Structure formats: structure tokens, C-alpha cells
Amino acid sequence: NINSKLALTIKSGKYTLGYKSVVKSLRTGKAKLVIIAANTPVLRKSELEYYAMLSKTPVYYFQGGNNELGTVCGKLFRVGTLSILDAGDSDILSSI
Amino acid sequence: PKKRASNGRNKKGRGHVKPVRCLNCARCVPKDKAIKRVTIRNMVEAAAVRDLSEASVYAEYALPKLYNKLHYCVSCAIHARIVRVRSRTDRKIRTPPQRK
Amino acid sequence: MRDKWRKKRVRRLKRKRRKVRARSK
Amino acid sequence: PLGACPEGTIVSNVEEKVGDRGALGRTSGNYVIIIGHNPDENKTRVKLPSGAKKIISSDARGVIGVVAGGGRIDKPLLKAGRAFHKYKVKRNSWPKTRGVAM
Amino acid sequence: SQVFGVARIFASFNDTFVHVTDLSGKETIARVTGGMKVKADRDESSPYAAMLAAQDVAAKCKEVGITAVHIKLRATGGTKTKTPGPGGQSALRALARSGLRIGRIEDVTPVPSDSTRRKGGRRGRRL
Amino acid sequence: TKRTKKVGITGKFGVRYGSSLRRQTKKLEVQQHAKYDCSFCGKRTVQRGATGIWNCKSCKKTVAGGAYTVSTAAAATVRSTIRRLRELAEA
Amino acid sequence: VLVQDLLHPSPATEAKQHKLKTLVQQPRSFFMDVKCQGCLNITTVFSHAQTAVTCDSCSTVLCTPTGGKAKLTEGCSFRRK
Amino acid sequence: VVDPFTRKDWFDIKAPTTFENRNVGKTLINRSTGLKNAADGLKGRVFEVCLADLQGSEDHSYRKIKLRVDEVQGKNLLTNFHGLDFTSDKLRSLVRKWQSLVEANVTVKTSDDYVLRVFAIAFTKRQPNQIKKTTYAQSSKLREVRKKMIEIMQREVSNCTLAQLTSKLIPEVIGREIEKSTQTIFPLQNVHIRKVKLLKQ
RNA sequence: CUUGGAUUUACUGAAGACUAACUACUGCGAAAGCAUUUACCAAGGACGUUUUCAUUAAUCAAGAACGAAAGUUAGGGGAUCGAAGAUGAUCAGAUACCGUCGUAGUCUUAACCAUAAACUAUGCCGACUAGGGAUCGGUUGUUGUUCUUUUAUUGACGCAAUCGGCACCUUACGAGAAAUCAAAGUCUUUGGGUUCUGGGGGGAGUAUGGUCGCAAGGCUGAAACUUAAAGGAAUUGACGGAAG
Ligand SMILES: O[C@H](c1cc(C(F)(F)F)nc2c(C(F)(F)F)cccc12)[C@@H]1CCCCN1
Ligand SMILES: [Mg+2]
Ligand SMILES: [Mg+2]
Ligand SMILES: [Mg+2]
Ligand SMILES: [Mg+2]
Ligand SMILES: [Mg+2]
Ligand SMILES: [Mg+2]
Ligand SMILES: [Mg+2]
Ligand SMILES: [Mg+2]
Ligand SMILES: [Mg+2]
Ligand SMILES: [Mg+2]
Ligand SMILES: [Mg+2]
Ligand SMILES: [Mg+2]
Ligand SMILES: [Mg+2]
Ligand SMILES: [Mg+2]
Ligand SMILES: [Mg+2]
Ligand SMILES: [Mg+2]
Ligand SMILES: [Mg+2]
Ligand SMILES: [Mg+2]
Ligand SMILES: [Mg+2]
Ligand SMILES: [Mg+2]
Ligand SMILES: [Mg+2]
Ligand SMILES: [Zn+2]
Ligand SMILES: [Zn+2]
Structure with missing residues (x-):
């Protein structure tokens, strides 16, 4: 179900893919949600979640690796983390 | 020639049916072909239901039954006379025999 | 003879034929 | 410690005696299976790679898992040179002349 | 007041x-x-031998003090036959007739x- | 083009050692020369070092594995048994 | 039966026939005008509707699709056209 | 030779207060000697006694309770609840043809951290005015009944201690509540909690 | 195998398989096949439709996918059964039936093999010809019935229709050598479309050649020669270490 919600958000809404974009969006306060893949290094995870704690942003832990997060986003590359900037037709922020 | 329109089994609209072992000889027989009898017998014969009821510490105690479902192959059943060879015209009758 | 055992016999005779020709290649 | 591992635990580098720092199941692909415990006598029964059952102190230690590098014997050496290089860093036991040929 | 085995x-x-x-x-x-x-092996399972064995069991139990028993009849079970042998009914009647309470x-x-394969082979045991 | 019909990597051995031994070498030597998925970074950069040693070129993680494959069945079973026991009834 | 009027079948047996097996096939569905309790606005809805149609006035679902005829929600009254 | 029964000492088994006839019966063991105590070999014993005996009433004749002894006070054995099961003959008399059988099981923890597996069983009931030969429920209905079963055992076990659960079991509260809760799904008969198992103590 | 405590009994644990009863003239799948729960992944028939496209279709040499069991190669597992083998009986002999063990195998992972009485011994598509009751899925109309909950928009059940299935019962207009068959009918009153196969029995699924396969083997496949029958269904009798 979350795959369908994520596909709808990627298709209609706004997002950034990648650690540097996610951290920039957390610094600027433009992030509504940060999704982190399961096989992300723990040091990077605990740093993303310290940024999210400071920014008051929810964190969703994807159960698959960055290969499955990449194919969920409809991408042909790997996505270690991503931030949802604007949930459009989806309700992921209201469901997570 | 063809002896039975059902081929002696009960497989129609089906490819394969998992087998069962004959109770008497342990022969692998398809589940639909096996001769199956459901028996619910008293565990104590009526001769001994009296002395066992008097020896019972419970007044008005019902003796439990023994429930069993027996599976026979065609050879097991014919040998034990569970089923018998019937005439050509009498083979078609599918009502249960009227004995019980 | 039984057809199945006759078939096994013929298989054994083909085996012998094959080995005999293989002897001289 | 062996007593801290439930029955059926696959364990490796197990101590025969408390403190010898590992004796059993040390070669590639090998391990020791913990069969059961006898808490009254403080003993544990294990099954060794040879198939033997042994009784060890429950205070003896072991490492959880299978020794790495397994499946090595599955490939043929294919060559005398391969056996030569195998024993060049083990010891002088190869090649072997048959005693009947002496 | 009774003692059940x-x-x-x-x-x-x-x-x-x-x-x-x-x-x-x-x-x-x-x-x-x-x-x-x-x-005789052919009559180790006879009703006569089972009843006599049960009567001797009751006599030995009584002198130890067990005055009543619950009955747990069983057949061979498993992959083998599920019907009890002919001697269990005689041993039960003998126990009831020996003064022991049931x-x-x-x-x-x-x-x-389901099971774990049964002996005899695919074609069963012939004879 | 396709260069060999069936020998594949064992074509370096020529006609020697016997066909059964060469196909036995081929089975395990394709496994020892294959590239495996890194369980840590997700890239296909894992190669064997010595026997039992599997390195990832990308993230420089070394993992202990099998002689010719990254994971043996016994190790896979222990990994799954431990993950069950924990992430389940025993929390 | 050798003699039978095939061109003028009895309408009782004609109505029991399957919809494709009549002399001229004709749908058995129809359109209804559904009045929700909240307001009064004619809204044409197909009887075997596959969509959860909502009226313009109040955002209330008029019918829910089923295997056959759509099931109207409570407080909604229908009249066959 | 020696008659080892001269060295047997009889002990009394005491049931929890949930039952009525707390005088379960008598057991025996080798008399406590210097080398071997009677206590260590007598504790840990499991007694299987029928609930009809534990309650006097014959309405419980088809359920039998396992009591596990874990403390000894003189000649009395203080037992605790160890499990529930149906008799084989009762289950075989309930499993007829021309009807649907539905089963469910769940691993559940009590209020006091007693790990149980509870097995529920039920059968479709043939209506009094029913004419067709068979009474079969669709597999979707069986899945919905199974889900309602699962969430009812989960609720009625996680909200109570083991003694209270036993007090719920004796008048068959859970089976009647499952039957009541599944009325709008399919008619059922002989709805029972047929087995409860202790895994870890 | 057993006074070295067997068998039996209770508790505990570990291994692999396997899913009893429910289970049926019942379901699904192209077939082989598929039966513990739940989750996830992608499929499917039927039904309903006053949605959409408009001949896109039917059968198919060549060429492909899948294909029970057994079998082959290598790991894993290897509880139970158990080819081979070993053993105790029977017998004139039994290296057979019966008893006790038992290796491959049985299970699984990567690949092979492509055969079965793989059977409904009945190719696939289409039209028509005769009555009946059951049953599974869907849909549409309706109860002196039980039930949600106390009632409805609960569900179950009951009565009718219908489409699709798995089948069944009676008759024989009709077919057939008959057994029998609602198709094996609409075939000398011979023509709806199309694929495959057979031409007396053996020799023979043999030889040879080709091709696939690691192998076992698979597919394709003669001739010389030989022979007056072989065979199908039914009738009367005779016989049976079959029943009455
Ligand atoms: O006692 C068994 C058991 C087996 C095995 C294994 F298969 F790996 F050898 N490992 C077990 C372990 C272990 F730690 F993984 F080794 C702990 C407890 C029980 C184990 C069962 C089966 C697995 C789930 C419950 N324990
Ligand atoms: Mg015949
Ligand atoms: Mg079908
Ligand atoms: Mg078949
Ligand atoms: Mg030397
Ligand atoms: Mg050597
Ligand atoms: Mg010399
Ligand atoms: Mg015989
Ligand atoms: Mg079952
Ligand atoms: Mg079904
Ligand atoms: Mg072809
Ligand atoms: Mg193997
Ligand atoms: Mg074996
Ligand atoms: Mg055996
Ligand atoms: Mg012999
Ligand atoms: Mg034998
Ligand atoms: Mg063929
Ligand atoms: Mg058939
Ligand atoms: Mg054929
Ligand atoms: Mg219907
Ligand atoms: Mg010819
Ligand atoms: Mg004939
Ligand atoms: Zn047979
Ligand atoms: Zn890596």
C-alpha cells in the first residue's frame, strides 16, 4: 500500500532524492517527510534523524534497500534517502 | 470392453487425486477409488456394558464411542466381502443398501 | 513374452549391438 | 558460555575445558551442535563434526555460527602443482611414495 | 475417598x-x-491371556493400595491399524470383574x- | 560470437584432467569469479579475495563467506534462525 | 412440439428469457432519478453503475457498485425512468 | 526381591481454587532418603484430570485439565494450570460430513506473562428449514470467521490473567462469545476453544 | 532388541518429511498437477455492463513453453519407507510372494532428462436435434423460516428464473458389429472449417543415417524375409484354489 502511496506522490507531488538534497531541504525547512532506506549506514541515519529532530520532521523507515527505494520511485538508480516536499494527490503525510 | 462408465472410480473434471493406504494391506489406492466405511462402534460390547456400569463410580455414565473411517482398496474390500460381485444390470444401482 | 520385458530384452540387445560396433569404431 | 546457548545452537571454536581458548570445530565449514544441557551437574552435551557426542563443562565458551570458507573441498585440485602449492605452506608431507614400491 | 491411578x-x-x-x-x-x-506367540494377544493378565494386575495393584483407575485404551496407532486389539476388551472386563473400580x-x-509413509510398499503386502 | 559450446571458463584447461573434473571445476569457478550484491551499499562490487574473504570495491567492507560463494546454506540457515528467534515471539 | 408461434411468443415466457436470447435482444437495465434526503436535485444514474457517483449539490455517494445493480445509500430514493 | 513399593510415600494433589473438588487424588514417589529427596523427584509432575471431575458437573465431561505441580507443602502438592484439550471421542463426534470445519490458532501472552497457544474450532450449522443436502461456507467466509476468532482470542487472553482465563473457560465464555460475534457471518455450531498450551513458564 | 533394564509410561528436546478426520459422482488449472495459517507479488474463468476497438478471427507444417514418476551431475539435508544388497522362513528349487535390517532414492538448491494405460483409450472451433432433477460461481425477482440486536442497509436459509461449468438419471427419434452413445446423432438422402494418425499379422519401433542428451535414452525410421489369419463385440456351453 505504501508503494502505491509513494508512486502517487512521486507522480504528482514534489520530492528530492539523495542525502545532500535531503539535508539541504531539512536546513531550509522545506521538507514534510524524510524516508530512509533500511540498508543506509547507521551513522548517516542517526545524522538524518538528528536533523529531522531539530527540524520537527517525520521519518519513515523504508523496509527495503536503496535498490528497492529507487525502483519504488520509478528510477533506474539507487536512492539511499529521499524527502517529500509536497504531497500532492497522495496522503502519505497523513498516513505514515 | 468398458466395464463401468465411471471407470470404477469417482474422478470427473479432475486430473489427479492424492492416494490413501488400504487399512488391511497398505496398498496405495487413489482416494476417490477406495471403498470407505464410517464406523461408530461402542467401545464396550453390550454384554459387558452392564458389569462395567455397575462397576462405574458414576451414576448414569455414558460410555464413549469409537469413531473410525476405514479405507480399503478393491482387493481388500472384495476379499473381506465389504462389496460383492453384482450382475451386469445390478451394477448401476447407486442407492445405499437398505440394511441399517 | 510380456511386452514390457520383451522391450527390456531388446534394449539389452541394442546395448550389445552398440558396444560391438564401438569395439572397432 | 555453552550454558547460555539454547539447545540446537550452532556454535564454533568450542572449548573442551574452561579456558583453553578454543579446541573444537575450527576448520572451514565445520561447527558444533549443542544437543542439550544438564544444569544439576553443570554439563552440556554437544555433537562434534566427526559425529561424536561429548560432555563439556557448561562454563566452556564457543563462537556462534559456522566457520567461514566452507565448501573448499568441493573443487578438485586438478594438478600436482596445486597440491604442491597447498603443502608448500603447510609441511613436508607431499608427495608420498607407496611403500609397496620401495 | 478412592485413590485413582x-x-x-x-x-x-x-x-x-x-x-x-x-x-x-x-x-x-x-x-x-x-x-x-x-x-505361544500365536496367542500372546488372546482374550484369555489378556483377561488373566489384567486379573493378576488388579491383584498386584490392590495390595499396594490403588483402589480406582481411569481407563486409557489405545491401539498401535501411527501409520498402523487404528482399531484396538481383541484383548483390550477382555482385559477391561476382567479388571471390572476383579473388584477394582473403574x-x-x-x-x-x-x-x-497426515503421516510419514507407511510400510508395505506401493502395491501393499501380498500373500 | 559464442566461443565455446560448453566448456566456458574451463577452456583454459585444454583437453586435460577429464571432462567430469573440468565441469566440476567450471561449476565452482563461475561462482568464485562472479560478482555479488553488497548487503551494505547495494552495488555489484563484491569479489573474492582469498578463500572465505569477500571484499566490496566500493564501500571497502570485507565479509567472511564461503570458499567459492558469498554465503553457504548453513550460514543462511543460522542467519534466518537468529533473525526469527529475535524479531518475533522473543522480541 | 411441431407447431408453435415463434414470431409472437407469450410475453410471460419471453420476459424470463436471457437478455441475449430474445427475438430482439434488449437490455434489462434502466436509468433512475435518485433523490437524496438532503436536497432536491435530479441526478441521472445508471442502474448497473460501476462508479460511486456523487451529486453536485452535496458530496454524498449516491450508489456503490456491486456485481450487478448498484446499491443506493440510505436516505436515497429512486424512481425508474 | 526388595518390593520397591515399600519405599513409596503417598502425597496429595491440590488444584487451584477455580475448581470445586480440590481433592484431586493421591500420588506416590520413592521415600526421601539421604541420597535422594522425594521432593525434587515429585515436583514438576503433570497430572491430567478431567474437568468434569474438577467441577462435579457432567457438562464438562469432554474437557480435561493438565495441572503442573511446582511447590510442595508436606504431603500436599500445590499445582497450577498447565493446559486444556478436548477428548478424542468428542472431537470425532463433532466432525461430521456435509458441513464445513473452521479452525484457528494464536500465540498469545497473558497479563502475568504466561505464553499460550489457543486453538479454536467451529462447524457450520444446518438450519431447521434447510432443504439442500450440504452446508458449506465459502472460503472467504471461513477467512472472515477465522479473523474474528483470532481477534477474539487475542482480546480475551491479553486482557486477563491465567486464573481469570480459566474462570472464563469453565462456562465456555470465549466459545459463546465467538459464536455470538460471528452470527452475521455464518451460522455455527459446537464453537469451542478446544486446546490451550503452555510454552514457557 | 532384551536384568548392561528392552517393550511400556510421563515430561522435555532435536531432525526431516507429510497436511488425517472435514474430503463429495465437489472446486481450480493448458496439461502434468494443486488440500495447515497469514502476509506480499503478479495472474485467471464466469457473471454484470445502453463502456471501448471494429474482423482484429478458427485450426495450425517449421519453430517454441510447460511437462507425474523414475533416472543423471554437484552441494544441502538425510526422520520414515525403501530398488540393489544382506538376512529368517516356505519350497524339490526359489537369490519371489511373507519377516527384520538396509545403499542409492524418497525432501531441497542449481542444472539436465521429455517419457506414462501422460485415458474420457473419444483433437480443436462452430450450428442444430429430448425430457428431468441435483450441484458449484455470478446476476435478477420473492418467504407461516432462524438469526444481527431490538429492527432495518446483517448474514443464513426457502422459492423461482437465467447465463457458464463438473457431472448424473430415463428414452432411443438417430447412430453403431455390438458393448454402448445427448454424442460415438444431424454419415450412400454421403460436403461447416481445420490439424494429426492408420491401410492384414509378424520382422519392428528393429537395422542404417541424422539430430538432441553427460549417460540412461528420446525424436525420425526401413527393407530382406515370413505368414492365413491376428484382432473387436456379443451368444451357448465348460471351467475357477470367486460369490450366493
Ligand atoms: O531449537 C531449534 C534451533 C535450531 C537451530 C539451527 F537450525 F540453526 F540449528 N538454531 C537454534 C538456535 C540458534 F541460536 F540459532 F542456533 C537457537 C535456538 C534454537 C535453535 C529450533 C528451530 C528453529 C526455531 C526454534 N528453535
Ligand atoms: Mg476383462
Ligand atoms: Mg476445468
Ligand atoms: Mg494422470
Ligand atoms: Mg618430500
Ligand atoms: Mg595420494
Ligand atoms: Mg624398486
Ligand atoms: Mg490373494
Ligand atoms: Mg488438516
Ligand atoms: Mg471447495
Ligand atoms: Mg511440431
Ligand atoms: Mg545428493
Ligand atoms: Mg536415507
Ligand atoms: Mg525399514
Ligand atoms: Mg534365501
Ligand atoms: Mg520383504
Ligand atoms: Mg507415447
Ligand atoms: Mg482415467
Ligand atoms: Mg494416446
Ligand atoms: Mg446458484
Ligand atoms: Mg502393416
Ligand atoms: Mg473377445
Ligand atoms: Zn492392486
Ligand atoms: Zn559495498
Whole structure:
């Protein structure tokens, strides 16, 4: 179900893919949600979640690796983390 | 020639049916072909239901039954006379025999 | 003879034929 | 410690005696299976790679898992040179002349 | 006021076990088999041998003090036959007729969910 | 083009050692020269070092594995048994 | 039966026939005008509707699709056209 | 030879207060000697006694309770609840043809951290005015009944201690509540909690 | 195998398989096949439709996918059964039936093999010809019935229709050598479309050649020669270590 919600958000809404974009969006306060893949290094995870704690942003832990997060986003590359900037037709922020 | 329109089994609209072992000889027989009898017998014969009821510490105690479902192959059943060879015209009758 | 055992016999005779020709290649 | 591992635990580098720092199941692909415990006598029964059952102190230690590098014997050496290089860093036991040929 | 044991009677088609334990079943009080009372294998499972064995079991149990038993009849079970042997009924009637008191009777034949292959082969045992 | 019909990597051995031994070498030597998925970074950069040693070129993680494959069946079973026991009834 | 009027079948047996097996096939569905309790606005809805149609006035679902005829929600009254 | 029964000492088994006839019966063990105590070999014993005996009433004749002894006070054995099961004959008399059988099981923890597996069983009931030969429920209905079963055992076990659950079991509260809760799904008969198992103590 | 405590009994644990009863003239799948729960992944028939496209279709040499069991190669597992083998009986002999063990195998992972009485011994598509009751899925109309909950928009059940299935019962207009068949009918009153196969029995699924396969083997496949029958269904009798 979350795959369908994520596909709808990627298709209609706004997002950034990648650690540097996610951290920039957390610094600027433009992030509504940060999704982190399961096989992300723990040091990077605990740093993303310290940024999210400071920014008051929810964190969703994807159960698959960055290969499955990449194919969920409809991408042909790997996505270690991503931030949802604007949930459009989806309700992921209201469901997570 | 063809002896039975059902081929002696009960497989129609089906490819394969998992087998069962004959109770008497342990022969692998398809589940639909096996001769199956459901028996619910008293565990104590009526001769001994009296002395066992008097020896019972419970007044008005019902003796439990023994429930069993027996599976026979065609050879097991014919040998034990569970089923018998019937005439050509009498083979078609599918009502249960009227004995019980 | 039984057809199945006759078939096994013929298989054994083909085996012998094959080995005999293989002897001289 | 062996007593801290439930029955059926696959364990490796197990101590025969408390403190010898590992004796059993040390070669590639090998391990020791913990069969059961006898808490009254403080003993544990294990099954060794040879198939033997042994009784060890429950205070003896072991490492959880299978020794790495397994499946090595599955490939043929294919060559005398391969056996030569195998024993060049083990010891002088190869090649072997048959005693009947002496 | 009575003291209950558990009379675990195992009646197969080759022998008959009359095994009297306590209520818990960890303590055996008397175990006389039908093969201990006759010298022919063909009649180790006879009703006569099972009844005599049960009567001797009752006599030995009484002098130890067990005054009542619950009955747990069983057949061989497993992949083999599920019907109790001919001697279990005679050993039960003999126990009832020997002055010992009988409580509940239950069948505890081991019945597998499905199974684990049965001996005899695909074509069964011929003869 | 396709260069060999069936020998594959064992074509370096020529006609020697016997066909059964060469196909036995081929089975395990394709496994020891294959590239495996890194369980840590997700890239296909894992190669064997010495026997039992599997290195990832990308993230420089070394993992202990099998002689010719990254994971043996016994190790896979222990990994799954431990993950069950924990992430389940025993929390 | 050798003699039978095939061109003028009895309308009782004609109505029991399957919809494709009549002399001229004709749908058995129809359109209804559904009045929700909240307001009064004619809204044409197909009887075997596959969509959860909502009226313009109040955002209330008029019918829910089923295997056959759509099931109207409570407080909604229908009249066959 | 020695007659090892001269060295047997009889002990009394005491049931929890949930039952009525707390005089379960008598057991025996080798008399406590210097080398071997009677206590260590007598504790840990499991007694299987029918609930009809534990309650006097014959309405419980088809359920039998396992009591596990874990403390000894002189000649009395203080037992605790160890499990529930149906008799084989009762289950075989309930499993007829021309009807649907539905089963469910769940691993559940009590209020006091007693790990149980509870097995529920039920059968479709043939209506009094029913004419067709068979009474079969669709597999979707069986899945919905199974889910309602699962969430009812989960609720009625996680909200109570083991003694209270036993007090719920004796009048068959859970089976009647499952039957009541599944009325709008399919008619059922002989709805029972047929087995409860202790895994870890 | 057993006074070295067997068998039996209770508790505990570990291994692999396997899913009893429910289970049926019942379901699904192209077939082989598929039966513990739940989750996830992608499929499917039927039904309903006053949605959409408009001949896109039917059968198919060549060429492909899948294909029970057994079998082959290598790991894993290897509880139970168990080819081979070993053993105790029976017998004139039994290296057979019966008993006790038992290796491959049985299970699984990567690949092979492509055969079965793989059967409904009945190719696939289409039209028509005769009555009946059951049953599974869907849909549409309706109860002196039980039930949600106390009632409805609960569900179950009951009565009718219908489409699709798995089948069944009676008759024989009709077919057939008959057994029998609602198709094996609409075939000398011979023509709806199309694929495959057979031409007396053996020799023979043999030889040879080709091709696939690691192998076992698979597919394709003669001739010389030989022979008056072989065979199908039914009738009367005779016989049976079959029943009455
Ligand atoms: O006692 C068994 C058991 C087996 C095995 C294994 F298969 F790996 F050898 N490992 C077990 C372990 C272990 F730690 F993974 F080794 C702990 C407890 C029980 C184990 C069962 C089966 C697995 C789930 C419950 N324990
Ligand atoms: Mg015949
Ligand atoms: Mg079908
Ligand atoms: Mg078949
Ligand atoms: Mg040297
Ligand atoms: Mg050598
Ligand atoms: Mg010399
Ligand atoms: Mg015979
Ligand atoms: Mg089952
Ligand atoms: Mg079904
Ligand atoms: Mg072709
Ligand atoms: Mg193997
Ligand atoms: Mg084996
Ligand atoms: Mg065996
Ligand atoms: Mg011999
Ligand atoms: Mg034998
Ligand atoms: Mg063929
Ligand atoms: Mg058939
Ligand atoms: Mg054919
Ligand atoms: Mg219907
Ligand atoms: Mg010819
Ligand atoms: Mg003939
Ligand atoms: Zn047979
Ligand atoms: Zn890596």
C-alpha cells in the first residue's frame, strides 16, 4: 500500500532524492517527510534523524534497500534517502 | 470392453487425486477409488456394558464411542466381502443398501 | 513374452549391438 | 558460555575445558551442535563434526555460527602443482611414495 | 475417598499391555502383558491371556493400595491399524470383574495429522 | 560470437584432467569469479579475495563467506534462525 | 412440439428469457432519478453503475457498485425512468 | 526381591481454587532418603484430570485439565494450570460430513506473562428449514470467521490473567462469545476453544 | 532388541518429511498437477455492463513453453519407507510372494532428462436435434423460516428464473458389429472449417543415417524375409484354489 502511496506522490507531488538534497531541504525547512532506506549506514541515519529532530520532521523507515527505494520511485538508480516536499494527490503525510 | 462408465472410480473434471493406504494391506489406492466405511462402534460390547456400569463410580455414565473411517482398496474390500460381485444390470444401482 | 520385458530384452540387445560396433569404431 | 546457548545452537571454536581458548570445530565449514544441557551437574552435551557426542563443562565458551570458507573441498585440485602449492605452506608431507614400491 | 491411578491399556494385534500407573503417569504400579502369561506367540494377544493378565494386575495393584483407575485404551496407532486389539476388551472386563473400580474410559490412540509413509510398499503386502 | 559450446571458463584447461573434473571445476569457478550484491551499499562490487574473504570495491567492507560463494546454506540457515528467534515471539 | 408461434411468443415466457436470447435482444437495465434526503436535485444514474457517483449539490455517494445493480445509500430514493 | 513399593510415600494433589473438588487424588514417589529427596523427584509432575471431575458437573465431561505441580507443602502438592484439550471421542463426534470445519490458532501472552497457544474450532450449522443436502461456507467466509476468532482470542487472553482465563473457560465464555460475534457471518455450531498450551513458564 | 533394564509410561528436546478426520459422482488449472495459517507479488474463468476497438478471427507444417514418476551431475539435508544388497522362513528349487535390517532414492538448491494405460483409450472451433432433477460461481425477482440486536442497509436459509461449468438419471427419434452413445446423432438422402494418425499379422519401433542428451535414452525410421489369419463385440456351453 505504501508503494502505491509513494508512486502517487512521486507522480504528482514534489520530492528530492539523495542525502545532500535531503539535508539541504531539512536546513531550509522545506521538507514534510524524510524516508530512509533500511540498508543506509547507521551513522548517516542517526545524522538524518538528528536533523529531522531539530527540524520537527517525520521519518519513515523504508523496509527495503536503496535498490528497492529507487525502483519504488520509478528510477533506474539507487536512492539511499529521499524527502517529500509536497504531497500532492497522495496522503502519505497523513498516513505514515 | 468398458466395464463401468465411471471407470470404477469417482474422478470427473479432475486430473489427479492424492492416494490413501488400504487399512488391511497398505496398498496405495487413489482416494476417490477406495471403498470407505464410517464406523461408530461402542467401545464396550453390550454384554459387558452392564458389569462395567455397575462397576462405574458414576451414576448414569455414558460410555464413549469409537469413531473410525476405514479405507480399503478393491482387493481388500472384495476379499473381506465389504462389496460383492453384482450382475451386469445390478451394477448401476447407486442407492445405499437398505440394511441399517 | 510380456511386452514390457520383451522391450527390456531388446534394449539389452541394442546395448550389445552398440558396444560391438564401438569395439572397432 | 555453552550454558547460555539454547539447545540446537550452532556454535564454533568450542572449548573442551574452561579456558583453553578454543579446541573444537575450527576448520572451514565445520561447527558444533549443542544437543542439550544438564544444569544439576553443570554439563552440556554437544555433537562434534566427526559425529561424536561429548560432555563439556557448561562454563566452556564457543563462537556462534559456522566457520567461514566452507565448501573448499568441493573443487578438485586438478594438478600436482596445486597440491604442491597447498603443502608448500603447510609441511613436508607431499608427495608420498607407496611403500609397496620401495 | 478412592485413590485413582491410570490404567493405560495398549491392545495391539500382536500383544496386549496392561500398564497401571498413578494419576500423573510417571510412576508405574503394575505392568503385566499378555505375552507373559502364555508360551505361544500365536496367542500372546488372546482374550484369555489378556483377561488373566489384567486379573493378576488388579491383584498386584490392590495390595499396594490403588483402589480406582481411569481407563486409557489405545491401539498401535501411527501409520498402523487404528482399531484396538481383541484383548483390550477382555482385559477391561476382567479388571471390572476383579473388584477394582473403574472411572472414565478414553481412547488415546496416536492419530497423526497426515503421516510419514507407511510400510508395505506401493502395491501393499501380498500373500 | 559464442566461443565455446560448453566448456566456458574451463577452456583454459585444454583437453586435460577429464571432462567430469573440468565441469566440476567450471561449476565452482563461475561462482568464485562472479560478482555479488553488497548487503551494505547495494552495488555489484563484491569479489573474492582469498578463500572465505569477500571484499566490496566500493564501500571497502570485507565479509567472511564461503570458499567459492558469498554465503553457504548453513550460514543462511543460522542467519534466518537468529533473525526469527529475535524479531518475533522473543522480541 | 411441431407447431408453435415463434414470431409472437407469450410475453410471460419471453420476459424470463436471457437478455441475449430474445427475438430482439434488449437490455434489462434502466436509468433512475435518485433523490437524496438532503436536497432536491435530479441526478441521472445508471442502474448497473460501476462508479460511486456523487451529486453536485452535496458530496454524498449516491450508489456503490456491486456485481450487478448498484446499491443506493440510505436516505436515497429512486424512481425508474 | 526388595518390593520397591515399600519405599513409596503417598502425597496429595491440590488444584487451584477455580475448581470445586480440590481433592484431586493421591500420588506416590520413592521415600526421601539421604541420597535422594522425594521432593525434587515429585515436583514438576503433570497430572491430567478431567474437568468434569474438577467441577462435579457432567457438562464438562469432554474437557480435561493438565495441572503442573511446582511447590510442595508436606504431603500436599500445590499445582497450577498447565493446559486444556478436548477428548478424542468428542472431537470425532463433532466432525461430521456435509458441513464445513473452521479452525484457528494464536500465540498469545497473558497479563502475568504466561505464553499460550489457543486453538479454536467451529462447524457450520444446518438450519431447521434447510432443504439442500450440504452446508458449506465459502472460503472467504471461513477467512472472515477465522479473523474474528483470532481477534477474539487475542482480546480475551491479553486482557486477563491465567486464573481469570480459566474462570472464563469453565462456562465456555470465549466459545459463546465467538459464536455470538460471528452470527452475521455464518451460522455455527459446537464453537469451542478446544486446546490451550503452555510454552514457557 | 532384551536384568548392561528392552517393550511400556510421563515430561522435555532435536531432525526431516507429510497436511488425517472435514474430503463429495465437489472446486481450480493448458496439461502434468494443486488440500495447515497469514502476509506480499503478479495472474485467471464466469457473471454484470445502453463502456471501448471494429474482423482484429478458427485450426495450425517449421519453430517454441510447460511437462507425474523414475533416472543423471554437484552441494544441502538425510526422520520414515525403501530398488540393489544382506538376512529368517516356505519350497524339490526359489537369490519371489511373507519377516527384520538396509545403499542409492524418497525432501531441497542449481542444472539436465521429455517419457506414462501422460485415458474420457473419444483433437480443436462452430450450428442444430429430448425430457428431468441435483450441484458449484455470478446476476435478477420473492418467504407461516432462524438469526444481527431490538429492527432495518446483517448474514443464513426457502422459492423461482437465467447465463457458464463438473457431472448424473430415463428414452432411443438417430447412430453403431455390438458393448454402448445427448454424442460415438444431424454419415450412400454421403460436403461447416481445420490439424494429426492408420491401410492384414509378424520382422519392428528393429537395422542404417541424422539430430538432441553427460549417460540412461528420446525424436525420425526401413527393407530382406515370413505368414492365413491376428484382432473387436456379443451368444451357448465348460471351467475357477470367486460369490450366493
Ligand atoms: O531449537 C531449534 C534451533 C535450531 C537451530 C539451527 F537450525 F540453526 F540449528 N538454531 C537454534 C538456535 C540458534 F541460536 F540459532 F542456533 C537457537 C535456538 C534454537 C535453535 C529450533 C528451530 C528453529 C526455531 C526454534 N528453535
Ligand atoms: Mg476383462
Ligand atoms: Mg476445468
Ligand atoms: Mg494422470
Ligand atoms: Mg618430500
Ligand atoms: Mg595420494
Ligand atoms: Mg624398486
Ligand atoms: Mg490373494
Ligand atoms: Mg488438516
Ligand atoms: Mg471447495
Ligand atoms: Mg511440431
Ligand atoms: Mg545428493
Ligand atoms: Mg536415507
Ligand atoms: Mg525399514
Ligand atoms: Mg534365501
Ligand atoms: Mg520383504
Ligand atoms: Mg507415447
Ligand atoms: Mg482415467
Ligand atoms: Mg494416446
Ligand atoms: Mg446458484
Ligand atoms: Mg502393416
Ligand atoms: Mg473377445
Ligand atoms: Zn492392486
Ligand atoms: Zn559495498
